[PDB]
Amino acid sequence: FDETEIEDFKEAFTVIDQNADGIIDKDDLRETFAAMGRLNVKNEELDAMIKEASGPINFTVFLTMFGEKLKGADPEDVIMGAFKVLDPDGKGSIKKSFLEELLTTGGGRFTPEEIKNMWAAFPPDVAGNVDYKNICYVITHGEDA
Amino acid sequence: FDETEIEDFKEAFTVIDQNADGIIDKDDLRETFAAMGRLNVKNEELDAMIKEASGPINFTVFLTMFGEKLKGADPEDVIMGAFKVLDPDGKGSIKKSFLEELLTTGGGRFTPEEIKNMWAAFPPDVAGNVDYKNICYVITHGEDA
Amino acid sequence: SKAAADDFKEAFLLFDRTGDAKITASQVGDIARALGQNPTNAEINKILGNPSKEEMNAAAITFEEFLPMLQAAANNKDQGTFEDFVEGLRVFDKEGNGTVMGAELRHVLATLGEKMTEEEVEELMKGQEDSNGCINYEAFVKHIMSV
Numbered sequence: 001f002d003e004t005e006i007e008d009f010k011e012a013f014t015v016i017d018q019n020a021d022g023i024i025d026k027d028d029l030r031e032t033f034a035a036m037g038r039l040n041v042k043n044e045e046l047d048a049m050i051k052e053a054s055g056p057i058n059f060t061v062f063l064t065m066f067g068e069k070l071k072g073a074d075p076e077d078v079i080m081g082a083f084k085v086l087d088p089d090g091k092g093s094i095k096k097s098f099l100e101e102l103l104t105t106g107g108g109r110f111t112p113e114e115i116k117n118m119w120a121a122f123p124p125d126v127a128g129n130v131d132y133k134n135i136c137y138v139i140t141h142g143e144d145a
Numbered sequence: 146f147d148e149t150e151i152e153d154f155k156e157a158f159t160v161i162d163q164n165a166d167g168i169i170d171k172d173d174l175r176e177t178f179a180a181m182g183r184l185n186v187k188n189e190e191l192d193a194m195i196k197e198a199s200g201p202i203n204f205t206v207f208l209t210m211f212g213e214k215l216k217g218a219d220p221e222d223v224i225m226g227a228f229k230v231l232d233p234d235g236k237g238s239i240k241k242s243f244l245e246e247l248l249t250t251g252g253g254r255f256t257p258e259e260i261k262n263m264w265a266a267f268p269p270d271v272a273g274n275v276d277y278k279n280i281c282y283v284i285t286h287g288e289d290a
Numbered sequence: 291s292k293a294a295a296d297d298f299k300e301a302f303l304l305f306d307r308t309g310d311a312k313i314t315a316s317q318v319g320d321i322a323r324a325l326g327q328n329p330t331n332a333e334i335n336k337i338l339g340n341p342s343k344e345e346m347n348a349a350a351i352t353f354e355e356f357l358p359m360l361q362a363a364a365n366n367k368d369q370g371t372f373e374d375f376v377e378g379l380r381v382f383d384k385e386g387n388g389t390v391m392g393a394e395l396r397h398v399l400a401t402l403g404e405k406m407t408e409e410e411v412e413e414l415m416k417g418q419e420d421s422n423g424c425i426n427y428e429a430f431v432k433h434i435m436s437v
Contacts, residue, residue, distance in 0.1 A: 003289045003290040004289075253307050
């Protein structure tokens, strides 16, 4: 965890903790979702978020919960560092079959089935290994941009 | 020591000295760490901080202890002064191999092994000598920002 | 002689990167220049070889060899006459005003005789040549003899 990433989680903690007392309760979760447009947010969704913690969601409990789910989270500059080492001549997005072979043949984390899931929402270019960069974006901030 | 840096150490001395009597004892160290989130701060850590002084931690004993550990501490404006003289055309971060050659070939403090340790937490850009400025930040205030 | 100038020994401690009080034979050319002596690089080369000293293999030094080599180079400072430096460049360009066209002096200083790198040539013209492309060598040789 770099310090600017921890400051981003402190700003997200303050936007969900609308009572500003330092502990995100279930009313803060529901009022942050209602301010984003969720008028139908069920109480069972709020209870499942609170069921991931053993205590009240203060800043260090929110940081330890996000730490334990993001144990391989990598910032965009280090993902582009590794993709610039995979394309060491610069500019070009690397081939689809080169990333499939190098993921498998180096590591067990790069096994195929997982490579079909990589192509599956990370579209073609991304999946193929040709573009580059959009995948670093969606690994640090999810969903389609 | 510039006077605003000494006023920053006076403000840090007042935040760790929560009894406000002018001497930071072991209870002040433990209650400042507990107010930052350290519920498990051992007494041996507090004893190792007090073992760096020959007497009670008043303001001049805290200033002399920090002076003797920071005998080459440089403010961010003087580090950016020297990096603007290394990049005299402005804007550009200087090359990795140029900083490795100029550190070694001018001084013994710029020897290589030390240059591998510079690249090692000061990441690539910083290490390489291309970016600039983030290294001035972390030399005046440590850890990842 | 001492006049025993003990600051030559203090400058040897500023050029020795290991702190063992020895200076390699490849640094001796540039340190004779930094002590106020301008021996040409062929002269520094000859003397070395003259004494069956090979600058091709690892070298160390001792102050006891560097002191007499600086004292053997110090007699040759009578070759530094500024009349011939300004008259050399006065024969290098037409008309009665001391101006070399930029690229004439840069290509001559890099390729004629003892090769100076184009990085060092740009560092010696920086400030004395303006954007007209004309180097005034009356002030240029004055500032080169100021160091």
